[PDB]
Design a protein around this ligand. Structure first.
Ligand SMILES: Nc1nc2c(ncn2[C@@H]2O[C@H](COP(=O)(O)OP(=O)(O)O)[C@@H](O)[C@H]2O)c(=O)[nH]1
Lengths: 285, 117, 160, 90, 90, 81
């Protein structure tokens, strides 16, 4: 399945793919929409499960809302299993009072015209994104969580792992895109998410500097390498640690240093969660 | 009364305490009838947590934990589960250096029949 | 400075068929050095052995740390209170018996200083047995490995 | 017809990983607690009234001859010397 | 001393600023005022009213809303002091 | 296990004493011959004041030669018949 980033001109889609994708995501342009027959829209929209519409908060959005409503009607008449999300963008220059009023105005303007159309069965989500923050990564993570059909199993696994091991917060990141596949039931703090995102940057950059011998051997590694595991202790009685789960996944957990004295039991539960994740994501019958 | 029989025979000729306690501290108390102190709940809690911990090893279920302390404070335990599935029963006994290494296996040999019946 | 190759060469000579793995770890389960009976040649055959030894050390350090807060020494040897005042005891051996193996945890009393290279955590010697292993030979191997590691770690505090 | 088998597979591997975890919060000092059941102790006497086994270690003693006693006291001394003659390096 | 967990109002069934587990706090009834303060007090304590009792939390944890902790400089996953104060004093 | 202790334990076992049992005050150190079906725990749990004893089970026919000095016990297994 693919992810289609819709919207209008000067909405911020190219900057989103510059930040997230450039460090299946497709960017349709702000013009030549579904009324035009320049592309086979019904063939693409059948294979696409996530539709994202980017709405500028500062600019006028009523024509954007009408284009969004006719695009929602088009994709519902194509397939009933598509997920629709609304990306309210360019909120870096806005104040704290402006964002809540803009979100309330956009949600009240959209969810009543959804009832006016009559397609009340489909769920439409709303996200506050900005390319200068990490909220675009969290919004794309919540988009990606809808497409994965294995989200409640991983979420229940992370819930019982956080309850058993006294782990405050857990994420299942993808290290290439800094997008977390699953997290626990506790809310995601932005101060936790920034240091969890930069933890991957420190690990990947130091492993790119010093992981030169073997590592990227063209034929095959003669010895199987260890998984990348890291531990950082901070001064505010908190410990961050990573364990490499798969070839593209990792598990960053936030644990108090009072509870990190029994780090062997947390390591054993991380190994059991590694076995669970590698058995879930393996090909089966 | 076999309780008074062992209460004379396992508290005199080797001088060991005997605790057949469990999770909820149903204290089969000190067999020389000394002061109970706080060592019973500490040893029983440590034995239940060690029996919980050692199941996750590859070697299987634990049979006994022979915990030898310094200058003759050697402790042996055997933990066995309840027949109705409501928990586990431990068998704690404390002796000297060569007092455990000797006739204490007789005391646990009677105590495992007790925990069976 | 501690050389783990020196510790591996010191523990390699005390390994028989009935004693597969001998490891040295801390009370928090952090492994320092370990040996094995057969040396693996495959990479994955080394990795799963290292993961098994790390899990064994991680469980054994907490199983030692559960019993280190209990003093059963006043509950034996009824005598005067000066003898009880001489009974400030610490745990130094712990033997656990299974169906398919044995485990021995012994605390290495490191010499030199009381704060030389440990922050109130004694190094623990873990000896893994099998069904045919005998527990009394493991105690002799444990006391020999302790008295050799203590003399090996008596020259700690290496400069610059 | 195939997604339900995947859901059953994920349910059983979730049960496996749930049973394989370690409760760290239960693994602490919950001591210095008041007693809970100090009354249910008469089951100990009514089960261990006799129960057909209160039997001493048997080892039924015959008397040794001086030849076998001399043989085993000669063998035990050199086995004790073999025990204290042990060494780590070969 | 209790661990400070943050939650979101209207998310996960939590519709109050304060979520109090009754099996952790058996002496706290409905409508009580709960004082939440730092150890070695640097800032003002937080007073909240109990409006619901849910048992979803683990032991020695108290759940406060995220914006209320952000206003009162309460760091998540920290030790706090939980006390019950009279309404006539505050 | 050392080689000289192994050959000494092989010198313990013969056509008369069919089983050799070396044990400390509480723990075994060396076995040879047919040491199975109990007949080891009764040697491990054994303790007495004197130094020279001969013991056989009254529900079996296996006679054990037992000596104990310097906290080391040697057991010899042979049938009573
Ligand atoms: N300062 C700021 N500028 C933004 C933000 N988002 C988007 N922009 C600007 O708005 C423009 C939007 O272009 P875009 O719609 O993505 O181009 P298109 O994809 O080809 O239609 C970009 O060139 C950005 O420079 C933001 O959050 N902050």
């Amino acid at each position: 399945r693919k992810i289609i980033l819709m919207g209008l001109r000067r909405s911020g889609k190219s900057s989103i793919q510059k930040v997230v994708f450039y460090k299946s995501v497709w960017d349709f342009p702000g013009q030549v929409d579904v009324f035009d027959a320049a592309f086979d829209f019904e063939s693409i929209f059948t294979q696409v499960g996530a539709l994202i519409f980017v709405i500028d908060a500062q600019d006028d959005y009523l024509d954007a809302l009408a284009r969004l409503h006719v695009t929602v009607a088009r994709v519902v008449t194509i397939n009933p299993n598509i997920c629709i999300e609304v990306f309210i963008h360019k909120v870096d220059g806005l104040s704290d009072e402006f964002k809540i009023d803009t979100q309330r105005d956009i949600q009240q303007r959209t969810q009543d015209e959804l009832a006016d159309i009559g397609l009340e069965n489909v769920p439409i989500s709303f996200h506050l994104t900005s390319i200068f923050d990490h909220s675009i990564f969290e919004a794309f993570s919540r988009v990606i969580q809808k497409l994965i059909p294995q989200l409640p199993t991983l979420e229940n696994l992370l819930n019982i792992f956080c309850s058993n091991s006294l782990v405050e917060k857990a994420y299942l990141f993808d290290v290439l895109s800094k997008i977390y596949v699953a997290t626990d039931s506790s809310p995601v703090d932005v101060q936790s998410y920034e240091i969890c995102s930069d933890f991957i940057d420190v690990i990947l950059d130091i492993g790119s500097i010093y992981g030169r011998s073997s590592q990227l051997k063209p034929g095959h590694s003669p010895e199987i390498l260890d998984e990348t595991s890291s531990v950082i202790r901070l001064s505010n009685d908190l410990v961050l640690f990573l364990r490499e789960m798969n070839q593209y996944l990792a598990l960053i957990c936030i644990v108090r240093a009072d509870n990190f004295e029994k780090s062997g039991l947390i390591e054993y539960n991380v190994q059991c969660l590694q076995t669970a994740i590698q058995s879930i994501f393996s090909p089966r019958t | 009364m076999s309780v008074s029989q062992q209460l004379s025979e396992l508290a005199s000729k080797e001088k060991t305490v005997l605790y057949v306690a469990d999770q909820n501290l149903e204290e089969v108390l000190c067999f020389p009838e000394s002061t109970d102190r706080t060592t019973l709940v500490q040893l029983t809690d440590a034995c239940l947590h060690a029996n919980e911990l050692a199941k996750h090893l590859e070697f299987g279920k634990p049979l006994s934990i022979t915990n030898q302390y310094s200058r003759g404070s050697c402790v042996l335990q055997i933990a066995k589960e309840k027949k109705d599935g409501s928990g586990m029963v431990v068998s704690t006994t404390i002796a000297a250096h060569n007092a455990l290494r000797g006739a204490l296996k007789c005391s646990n040999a009677l105590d495992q029949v007790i925990s069976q019946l | 400075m501690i050389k783990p190759k020196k510790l591996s060469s010191l523990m390699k000579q005390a390994v028989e068929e009935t004693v597969p793995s001998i490891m040295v770890f801390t009370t928090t389960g952090s492994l320092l050095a370990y040996v094995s009976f057969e040396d693996p040649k495959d990479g994955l055959k080394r990795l799963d052995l290292a993961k098994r030894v790390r899990s064994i050390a991680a469980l054994a350090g907490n199983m030692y740390s559960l019993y280190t807060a209990t003093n059963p020494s006043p509950l034996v040897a009824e005598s005067t209170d000066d003898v009880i005042a001489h009974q400030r005891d610490v745990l130094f051996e712990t033997i656990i018996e299974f169906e398919r193996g044995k485990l021995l945890i012994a605390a290495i009393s490191i010499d030199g200083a009381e704060d030389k290279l440990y922050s109130k955590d004694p190094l623990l010697l873990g000896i893994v047995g099998t069904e045919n292993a005998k527990e009394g030979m493991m105690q002799i191997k444990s006391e020999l490995l302790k008295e050799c590691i203590t003399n090996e770690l008596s020259t700690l505090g290496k400069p610059v | 017809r195939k997604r339900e088998e995947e859901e059953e597979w994920e349910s059983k591997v979730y049960d496996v990983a749930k049973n394989k975890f370690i409760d760290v919060f239960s693994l602490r000092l919950r001591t210095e607690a008041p007693q809970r059941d100090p009354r249910d102790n008469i089951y100990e006497e009514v089960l261990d009234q006799i129960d057909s086994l209160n039997l001493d270690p048997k080892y039924d003693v015959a008397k040794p001859t001086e030849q076998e006693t001399e043989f085993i006291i000669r063998k035990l001394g050199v086995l004790i010397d073999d025990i204290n003659n042990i060494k780590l390096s070969d | 001393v209790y661990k400070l967990v943050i939650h979101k109002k209207g998310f996960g069934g939590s519709d109050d600023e304060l979520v109090v587990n009754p099996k952790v706090f058996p002496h706290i009834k409905l409508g009580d005022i709960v004082e939440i303060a730092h150890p070695n007090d640097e800032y003002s304590p937080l007073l909240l009213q109990v409006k619901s009792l849910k048992e979803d939390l683990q032991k020695e944890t108290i759940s406060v809303d995220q914006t209320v902790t952000q206003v009162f400089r309460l760091r998540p996953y920290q030790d706090v002091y939980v006390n019950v104060v009279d309404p006539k004093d505050v | 296990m050392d080689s000289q202790l192994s050959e000494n334990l092989l010198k313990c076992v013969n056509e008369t004493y069919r089983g050799a049992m070396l044990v400390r005050n509480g723990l075994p150190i060396a076995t040879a011959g047919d040491v199975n079906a109990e007949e080891q725990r009764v040697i491990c749990e054994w303790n007495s004041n004197a130094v020279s004893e001969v013991l056989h089970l009254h529900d079996s026919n296996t006679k054990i030669l037992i000596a104990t000095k310097e906290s080391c016990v040697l057991g010899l297994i042979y049938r009573n018949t």
